[PDB]
Design an enzyme around this catalytic site. Structure first.
Site, PDB file in Angstrom:
ATOM      1  N   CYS A  31      73.954  17.557  53.233  1.00  0.00           N
ATOM      2  CA  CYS A  31      74.401  18.646  54.272  1.00  0.00           C
ATOM      3  C   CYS A  31      75.346  18.120  55.111  1.00  0.00           C
ATOM      4  O   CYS A  31      75.054  17.096  55.860  1.00  0.00           O
ATOM      5  CB  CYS A  31      73.115  19.213  54.975  1.00  0.00           C
ATOM      6  SG  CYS A  31      73.474  19.889  56.372  1.00  0.00           S
ATOM      7  N   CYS A  34      74.581  18.391  58.878  1.00  0.00           N
ATOM      8  CA  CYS A  34      73.661  17.671  59.276  1.00  0.00           C
ATOM      9  C   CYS A  34      74.116  16.344  59.623  1.00  0.00           C
ATOM     10  O   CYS A  34      73.839  15.682  60.744  1.00  0.00           O
ATOM     11  CB  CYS A  34      72.714  17.707  58.144  1.00  0.00           C
ATOM     12  SG  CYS A  34      71.978  19.352  57.765  1.00  0.00           S
TER      13      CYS A  34
END
Ligand SMILES: Nc1ncnc2c1ncn2[C@@H]1O[C@H](COP(=O)(O)OP(=O)(O)OP(=O)(O)O)[C@@H](O)[C@H]1O
Ligand SMILES: Nc1ncnc2c1ncn2[C@@H]1O[C@H](COP(=O)(O)OP(=O)(O)OP(=O)(O)O)[C@@H](O)[C@H]1O
Ligand SMILES: [Mg+2]
Lengths: 376, 243
Positions: A31, A34
């Protein structure tokens, strides 16, 4: 670091059974948004020491927990409060946007720690003093106005000065809510001279002056009694709300209640805080509209016009501009200007000539006549 | 300016000392008891922690400084009723602000000591600027002690005296004791003090009282000692030049 790395199992004891607010990051190494919030998140962990606890749960290693809360996005920040989801924040955020979210949810928690600080720390502490200044400001009687009827300047003159001002008061009362305060005058000057003669302190003089201000309030309030306007006191002003509501005016004694606890002057036994200060602080306390000082001169001049062949009138002046001009004798007590700067509600005063008809009525309707002394 | 009651000994008991209950109060009542045949005391009492709770509620309501001062002052009045009750068998009673100001000489001719509120009756007429009343317990005690031209003022705290930092705060290790100070020196330095910043302001305009000793009421003997001019805490010079 203070960041706790969680597991599917650990979530019951680390999140649900853990006291205080917890922010859990549902992240994964793949991700992108993230990898972006991750440095921002362990940074706020230190910036929020003891306020909030940061937690991380990598879905790739711990895949059970995420579907339990309907996590269908990455990253998703969940703010847990006593085993229950309080607020959610799906997607990437900036450094500022994260604090903006946390703060808007942790307001009750911040209030509780500020309250705790106001009960553990000293009142002299600057952090406590600063947090208090940040509190809300309530005006008790905001549509009310405070008027000072001068002792020596008007009440000591009698009928010629008082009777017309009473007529202006009984009429103006229909449109504005008035708090009429009284001065003392020559009877107070006499007491002060006698008491000073004996070397009695300012605390004692303060009590003497208070009585003359009471007499003047009793005399003024008698001419207004037929009109239902009352005289108030008792050091609690319990009668003020009903009277302002029904009859729209009250007569009070302009003297502060300091008595023997009166702060003395730099030198001498004359009480520094007399009826100008008593009236002003009562206008300041209630959060009144305006403060009008009704005197015997048009306003402030360069010098005392009673002892000056030619003085220049000052229609508008600030306290700094007054102090810098170095006033030998002022229209108002020197400490009132120091209180005006410190004032929270009454950030300017107006002085008017009550011997001139209409001056009070005109000043009351908001029109500037006489001297306006501004705080800044 | 003449000294009204020059034989008077003014003693201020800290509100936070009262807040300690029976453990602090009971020994202090015995110390005070034993002091009555020695001095003619006016025992003024502070507010403590309840004043903070009335501030937290009052400020949450948005109430101004002049609203908060009577409220705070009420708490000091209650610690006074408590202390006076413990000394009632010794003929000591709490007396109200109007009685302190006008009938203290009769009350002190009648009994050896009287309890009163430390806080001054500024009520609505409290000074603005700060949302917290400036003229509190220490200030009210000093204004009254200096007004009466009394023999002295003794502040009874829950600390040994004034320190460079709060001795019960986070930087307590970097805090050192001050046996002597000036009201001027303390006013210049910013941060927390066991005394009001307003007390130092009123000490600059003082007329009679030269020193104010801040002593630990949790240590029996300290108050007794201080009242005899013994240096057992922090002495604060007011800036009243002697003869
Ligand atoms: N520069 C000046 N400009 C205007 N008036 C001045 C000036 N200097 C002195 N005065 C005088 O100052 C006086 C201030 O008012 P006054 O002495 O009547 O107080 P008061 O309101 O009656 O209060 P108190 O209760 O203390 O007696 C006025 O009489 C005014 O003539
Ligand atoms: N410089 C300092 N020296 C000593 N104590 C300090 C200092 N700064 C802060 N303090 C703190 O001040 C505390 C005393 O509290 P505070 O003065 O609020 O109480 P009090 O005097 O009993 O109250 P009250 O004003 O109601 O009479 C001490 O216990 C200590 O933790
Ligand atoms: Mg204290």
């Amino acid at each position: 670091d203070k960041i706790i790395h969680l597991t599917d199992d650990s979530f019951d004891t680390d999140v649900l059974k853990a006291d205080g607010a917890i922010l859990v990051d549902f992240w994964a190494e793949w991700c992108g948004p993230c990898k972006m919030i991750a440095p921002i998140l362990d940074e706020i962990a230190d910036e929020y020491q003891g306020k909030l606890t940061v937690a991380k749960l990598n879905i790739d290693q711990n895949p059970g927990t995420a579907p339990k809360y309907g996590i269908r996005g990455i990253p998703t920040l969940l703010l847990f409060k006593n085993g229950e989801v309080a607020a959610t924040k799906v997607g990437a955020l900036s450094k500022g946007q994260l604090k903006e979210f946390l703060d808007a949810n942790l307001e009750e928690e911040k209030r509780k720690r500020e309250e705790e600080l106001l009960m553990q720390r000293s009142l002299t502490d600057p952090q406590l003093q600063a947090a208090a200044a940040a509190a809300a400001d309530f005006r008790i009687l905001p549509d009310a106005t405070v008027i000072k009827i001068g002792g020596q300047s008007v009440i000591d003159r009698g009928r010629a000065a008082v009777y017309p001002l009473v007529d202006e008061i009984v009429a103006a009362r229909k449109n504005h809510k008035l708090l009429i305060g009284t001065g003392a005058g020559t009877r107070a000057r006499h007491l002060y001279s006698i008491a000073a003669g004996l070397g009695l302190p300012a605390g004692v003089l303060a009590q003497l002056g208070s009585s003359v201000a009471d007499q003047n309030a009793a005399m003024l309030g008698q001419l207004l009694a037929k009109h239902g306007i009352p005289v108030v006191g008792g050091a609690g002003l319990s009668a003020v709300p009903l009277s302002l509501a029904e009859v729209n005016a009250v007569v009070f004694s302009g003297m502060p209640p300091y008595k023997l606890w009166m702060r003395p002057a730099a030198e001498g036994v004359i009480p520094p805080y007399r009826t100008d200060a008593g009236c002003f602080l009562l206008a300041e306390q209630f959060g009144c509209k305006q403060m009008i000082f009704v005197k015997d001169e048009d306003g402030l001049y360069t010098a005392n016009p009673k002892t000056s062949k030619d003085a220049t009138f000052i229609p508008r002046i600030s306290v700094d501009e007054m102090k810098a001009k170095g006033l030998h004798d002022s229209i108002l007590e020197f400490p009132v200007l120091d209180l005006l700067q410190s004032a929270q509600h009454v950030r300017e005063v107006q002085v008017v000539n009550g011997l001139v008809p209409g001056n009070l009525t005109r000043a009351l309707a908001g029109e500037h006549v006489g001297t306006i002394i501004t705080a800044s | 300016p003449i000294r009204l009651l020059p034989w008077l000994q003014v003693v201020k008991i800290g509100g936070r000392v009262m807040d300690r209950g029976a453990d602090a109060i009971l020994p202090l009542v015995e110390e005070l008891r034993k002091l009555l045949p020695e001095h003619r005391l006016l025992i003024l009492t502070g507010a403590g922690v309840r004043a903070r709770h009335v501030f937290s509620v009052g400020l949450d309501l948005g109430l101004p400084v002049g609203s908060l001062a009577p409220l705070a002052a009420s708490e000091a009045g209650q610690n006074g009723h408590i202390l006076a009750a413990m000394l009632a068998s010794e003929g000591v009673s709490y007396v109200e602000h109007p009685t302190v100001a006008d009938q203290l000489a009769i009350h002190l001719s009648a009994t050896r000591a009287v309890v009163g509120s430390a806080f001054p009756p500024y009520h609505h007429h409290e000074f603005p600027g700060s949302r917290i009343p400036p003229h509190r317990a220490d200030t009210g005690a000093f204004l009254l002690a200096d007004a009466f031209g009394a023999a002295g003022l003794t502040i009874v705290e829950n600390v040994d005296g004034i320190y460079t930092a709060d001795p019960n705060g986070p930087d307590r290790g970097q805090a050192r004791f001050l046996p002597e100070t000036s009201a001027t020196d303390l006013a210049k330095s910013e941060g927390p003090l066991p005394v009001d910043r307003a007390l130092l302001d009123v000490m600059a305009t003082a007329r009679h009282i030269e020193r104010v000793q801040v002593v630990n009421g949790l240590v029996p003997g300290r108050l007794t000692a201080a009242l005899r001019g013994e240096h057992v805490g922090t002495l604060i010079r007011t800036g009243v030049r002697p003869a």
